[model samples]
Target: SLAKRIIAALEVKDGRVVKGTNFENLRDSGDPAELGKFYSEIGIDELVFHDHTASVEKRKTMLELVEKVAEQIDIPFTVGGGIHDFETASELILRGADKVSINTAAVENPSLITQIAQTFGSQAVVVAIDAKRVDGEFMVFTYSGKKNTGILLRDWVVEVEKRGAGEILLTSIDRDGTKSGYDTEMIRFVRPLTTLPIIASGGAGKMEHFLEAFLAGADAALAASVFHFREIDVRELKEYLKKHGVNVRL
Candidate 1:
C-alpha cells in the first residue's frame, strides 16, 4: 500500500481555536500556535488554518493570525477565510503561507479562483467547498452555513476546476464537528467529477473514518476535533491507514 499525505486543520473563531457541528455555534478548543506546532511535530504532512469569522472581520484578523502561526512552525501551511481575490491570496503566501484556501469568496465571485490560480499557480490554490445536504442534494453554503448558494456540488466543483483550482477541500456541513466520519457519499460523487485531488473534511471521529474516506476516493482526509482534542495523533492515524491497505505516506 502506498502512503497518502494527511493535513490537519485548525478552525479559529473569536481569536481562539474552536470546534463545532454543522458550522453552527462553536466551542473553544485551544490556541492555534500551540496546536499547529503540536501537529507539525507529530508528523502531519501539512496544516490548514481556517478563521471562522465573517468576511469583514476575517480580512484583518485572519492575516495577522496566519503570520503569527507561520512564525511559530516550519511546515507547509495554508490559510483561509474571507479571501476573495488574488491580492489577499498573494499577501498570505508572501507572509509565509504555502497555499490559500477559498470558500465564500469563490462562491460570490467565481472568477477569483481563476485569477488567483493564474497569479500564484494552480498548485498554490485550494478550493474549500463547504456544503450541506438539502433534500438529498449537496448544496454549497457560505458564512458558516448560514447562507445557501443553491448550486449542486458536482457542477460547482467542475466549474472551479475549469477555473484553475488545483485541489478541492470538500467539507460536509452536516457532518462537521460531529466526529462521526467523513462524508463518503459526497467524496464519491465529487471525486469523478474532477481529476483534482480532494481533501475530505468534516466528521472524522476515528481512524476507521479515515479509511472509509480513502476507500471512497478522497486523496486525503482533514479533521479538526480529533486533532484539536488530541484524540488521535497524525502519526498513529497514518500507521492505522497503512495497516488498512490504504496508500499513505508514513
Candidate 2:
C-alpha cells in the first residue's frame, strides 16, 4: 500500500487562515503564507487552501494570495472554492495551485467535473464534497456548509468518479472542529464507491483519530482545527502512525 497522506487544511477567508467548530464562528488561525511554509517545512503530505465564500458569492479567489502561498510551500497544494469552470481552474493552476477543487460548482453542474478533468487532466482536478447528516442520510452541502443539496453522498461520489475526478475530499460537517475523531464509519461508507483516492477530511482531534481514519480506508487524512491550533504536530502524528504499523511518509 502507498503511504497514507497527512494534509494540512488552510481554510482561507479574507486572506487569513481561520478555524471553527462545525463550520460556525470561525476564529483567526494565522497567516496563510506563514502556515503554508511552516507545514511544508515541518513535513506535511499536502496542503489544501479552501477559499471559502467564493462560490456562494460568485467571486474569484485572490490570485496574489495564492501566489504567496505557492512561494511558501514546495509540497503539492490545491486551491478550492469559487472555481466553477475551465477559466478559473486554469488560472489557479497557472498561478501555482497544483490542483483545483470544486464543491458547490461541481454539485450545481456535474458536467463541470468532466470539463475540468478533460482540460486539466484528472490529476489536477479534485472534487470537494462537504457532507452533513440529514434525515439519516449523508447529504452534500455547498456554500461553506450552509445549504443542503439533498444529494446522497454515495451517489455523488460515484458520479464524480465517473466524471474523472482524481481524488475526493470528503468532509463531515458534524465532525468538523469537534476535536472528537474521524467518522470511521463515514470513511468506510464511501471508500468503495470509487477507485480514486479519498482525502478524508474534518473531525481530526488527536493522534489516534488519524490512525483510525487510515484504518477506516482514508488514503489521506485532512484536518484544520487540530493542525491549526497546535493540538497536534504533523511530524509527531506521522511518527506515531509509523510506530503503530500504519504506512506513512515519516
Candidate 3:
C-alpha cells in the first residue's frame, strides 16, 4: 500500500549533498551517488534527487547524476529541481530517470503541469508542493521556500491534481530540519482534496513519524535528516513500521 513506499530525499546544493534545518545552514552530508546506492541496496521504494540551487543555476545536473546513480542501483529513480519545460524533463528521462518532479515552474505556470503530463503521461510527472506555516495556515513557497507565492496550500494542490499531476510531494518548511516529525495537519488538509498519491516530507525525526504520517492520511513519507545522518536505517525503520501494525513491505 501507500505506506510501503518511502522516498529518501537527497537535497543538493553546490553539487554536494547537504543537510539543514528548514532549508538553511546546510552542512555537507556526503556524495549523492554513494548514498543513493546505499539506500537502493537497503530497498528504498524510490529515490528523490532535488538540486536546492535549481532556480539559481537555471540548469539541471540531473542527467549527469542519474547516469552515475543508475549504474549503481536498479530501481525507479526520479530527478527534480530547475526543470522548467518539457525538454529538460525529457532529457532526464532519456538519461535513465523514471520520473521528473517540478516545483517553481509548475506554480508560475500551471499549464506546464498539463503539458508535461500530456507528453509524458501523468505517471511521469510529480508536482512537489513546498509550504511553510504562516499564522497557522500553510502557504505555498517557491524558489526553495525563499519566496512566497501567496497561494494557499489546499487550492494549489487541487489545481495541480486537476492539471494531471500523478502525485504530490508535500513538504513543510517549518519541520524540514527540526526532526520534530511531519506536519500531519497539513497532510489531513490536503489528503481528501485530491485523489493523487501524497508524499509527505519534512520533520521526520523517528520511525514513529512515518507511522503518524500514514495514519494521518499520507500515502508515503519522505525524510532526509534521519537517513542522511545514519540515525535510522531504511530496513530497520520499515521493520519498526511493520511491527506497529502499519502495512509496509519489509
Candidate 4:
C-alpha cells in the first residue's frame, strides 16, 4: 500500500565501513562518506551509519565522520552507537544526522528513548534492537550485540513505541551477513506489536528477499554487504519491487 523504503546501512568501526556475520568477524568494506554519496546518488531511500564498536569501545559516535557523510549525501541519514544521553543525541542531530539510533544505551536506560524523542520530536529518534533466537525465544542483545539483555523482543518492541520512538531497526543476529534471506518470521512477530515503522536488517541476499520482508510487514529493508559490494543495484531493486505490486521510489 505505502511506499517501502530500501535502505543501505554502513556499519562503521575504526573509521571504516565494515560488515560481519552474526555481529562478529568484521571486515573492511569501504569509506563511509564515499559510499553514502554513491548510494544517495543511486536512489537508496535512506542511509544508516552505525559505529558498531563505539559502545564497547566506550566512546561516542564519530562526529567528524557524521558531518563528512552528511555533507556527501542528500538522503536521510541515521547515526547510532554509544548514544546514551540527550546531549550526544543532540550532537548527532546537530552534526547533520536526520535521526539518532540508540541500542545499547537505550537498553540500559529505556527512558533515553523518550528523552531524545521528546526533545527532537519522535521522528528524530530510532530504537535499534539486536536480537537472536535464544532457546526458541528472541532475546535482545546490547553493547554491540556482545551482551544478552534477557529482554524479549516483543516486550521491548512495545515498550519502545510507548516511549515515543519513531521507528524500530530490528536486526536479526542469527541471519545477519548470512546472505540467505531475512528472518521474516521475526518481522511478522514484531509487525503487530507496534505501529512504528519496522526496518528489517541483516540476511538480505537478493531482490526477492526484500519483497519477502515487505510481505512480512517490514516498512523498510536494510542491507550492508549486498549494497556495499554492488551485488544488487538499488534502482533495479525498486523497479523489481514496483513490478511486484510493492510501492517504491524510482
Candidate 5:
C-alpha cells in the first residue's frame, strides 16, 4: 500500500524543456506548458519544472512560465532555478507553483532557507542539491551545475535539514544523462541526514532505476531524458513497478 510517485520533470531552458548528459550539452525537449499539460493529462503522479539555465544565464526566474503552465494544468506545479530570495519565492508560489526548489539560493545564502521556510511553511520550500563525486565524496555544485560549491554533500544535507527545507531534490551530476541508473549508494548515503522527502533525480535511463531508487529509501524518483523523449511512458513505468511488487498509484 505504497503510493510511489513518478514525477515528470522538465529541465527547462529558454522556455523549452531541455535534456543533456552529465548536465551539459543541452537540447530542446519541448514547450514547457504543452509538455507539462501532457503529463498532467497522462496521470503522472507529479509535475516538476526547473529553469535549468536561469542561474547561469543571468535571467530572472521564469515565474511567468510557471503561471502559464499552472493555468493550463490542474496538477501540482513545482518550479525552481533563479529563485534567490523570499520575495521571488513567495511571488512564484503565488504566481502558480505549489512549491519552489532552491539550489543556488540555499547554498549561497543558507539564511534564505530558514527565512523562506519560516515565512511560507516547509512544505512549500524544496532545496535542490547538485552534487558530483569528487575524490571520495559527493560535493555540491552551484550555478546550474557550472561551479563546484566546495560543500560536502553529507554536511550540506545536515545543514539544509536543520535550516528548515521542506524537501531535498538530489541530482547526481556525474550520472545526470548517462541514463545508466541512479547512484543508489549516494541515495542511501544521504537518507539518514534528513527526514524530509527526498526526490532522487538524474541518471534514470531504465524503468528499474525507479525501483532501485525507491528501495534505496528516496521518497520519489525524478527523471528528464527518458520521459522527455517518450522512451518510457509514465503509465507503463507504474504498471511495470506494480508487477514487480513495488506498490505505486495507477
Candidate 6:
C-alpha cells in the first residue's frame, strides 16, 4: 500500500493565498509561492492550489502564480480553478503543475475529465468535489461553494472515476474552516464507490483528526488554515502518524 499523504492546501483569491470559515469570511494567509515553497521544503506529501473564484469569474487560473509555485516547490502540486477545457489543462501541466484539479468544469462538462485524462494521463487530473449534507443527502456544490449542483455526492464520485479522474479532492462545505475535524462519515460514504485515491479535505483541527481520517479510509488528508498558520507542523504530524502505525514518509 502507498504511504498515506499529508497535503497542504492553498486557497487563493486574486493574487494572495487566503483561508475562510465555512467558505466565507476570507482572511489573507501569505504569498502563494512562499507558502508552497515552505510546505514543500518541510516535506508535505503534496500541495493543492485552488483559485477560489476563478470559475465564477469566468477566467482562467493565474498562469503566473502557477509558474511561481512551480519554481519554488519541489513536491508534487496540483493547480485548480477556471480550468474548463483541455488547452487550459495542458497549459498548466506545461507550466509545471504536476496535476490540474477541475470542479466546476468537470461538473458542467463531464467529458473534460476524459479529455484531460486521455492526453495527460489520469495521474495528472484531479477532480475536486465540494459537498454539503442537505436534507439528509450529500449534494455537490460548485463555484467555490456558492452554487449547489443538486448532484448527489455518491453519483458524482462514481462518475468522476468512470470518466478517468486520477483522484477525488473531497471537501465538506460545512466542515471547511470549522476546525472541527474531517467529515469522516462523508469519506466512508465515498470510499467504496471508487477505486481512485480520495484526498479528504477541510476541517482538520489536530493530529488526531488526520489519523481519524486515515482510519476512515482517506488515502490522504488536506488542510488550509491549520498548516498556513503553523498551528500543526507537518513534520511533527508525520511523527504522530508514524507512532500511531500509519504508513507515512518522514
RMSD vs true structure, all candidates? 4.4, 4.2, 4.2, 4.3, 4.3, 4.3
For candidate 1, the per-residue lDDT at 66 reads 77
Query: Who is ahead in lDDT, 5 or 6?
Result: 6
TM-score of each: 0.88, 0.89, 0.89, 0.90, 0.89, 0.90
- Cα-based lDDT for every prediction: 0.82, 0.83, 0.83, 0.86, 0.82, 0.86
For lDDT, candidate 1 versus 6, the one ahead is: 6
The list of candidate 1 runs beyond 4 A from truth reads: 1-3, 13-15, 19-31, 53-60
Model 2 residue pairs with clashes: none
Clashes of 3: 2
The local lDDT score (0 to 100) that residue 44 gets in candidate 6 is: 92
Residues 160-180, candidate 6: write the lDDT tens digits: 999999999999998997999
TM-score of model 5 (CA atoms): 0.89
lDDT of 3 by residue, 1-250 (tens): 5445888888876566775323222332366777777777776888998876655453545667877778878877778978888888888887888889999999999998899888789988999999988887789999988998889998999899899998999988888878888999888999889999899999999888999999988887888778777687789998898888887767
lDDT of model number 3? 0.83
> Lowest-lDDT window of 10 residues in candidate 3?
20-29
Show where candidate 6 strays beyond 4 Å: 19-29, 52-61
Ranking by lDDT: 6, 4, 2, 3, 1, 5
**Location of the lowest summed lDDT over 10 successive residues in candidate 6:** 20-29
Give the per-residue lDDT digits (tens) of candidate 5, residues 1-250.
5556788887778776664322222332266787777676766777888775645543444766777888878867788867878998888888888888899989989989898888788888889999998899899999979998889999999999999988899999988879899988889999988888899988998888899999888888998778767788788898899998887877
Which residue ranges in model 4 land beyond 4 Å of their true spot? 19-29, 52-61
Candidate 2 per-residue C-alpha lDDT over 147-200 given as tens digits, one digit per residue, 9 for 90 to 100 = 988889989999999889999998889897688888888899998888999999
- Model with the higher TM-score, candidate 2 or 4: 4
Please give the distance, in angstroms, between residue 214's alpha carbon in candidate 1 and its true position after superposition: 0.6
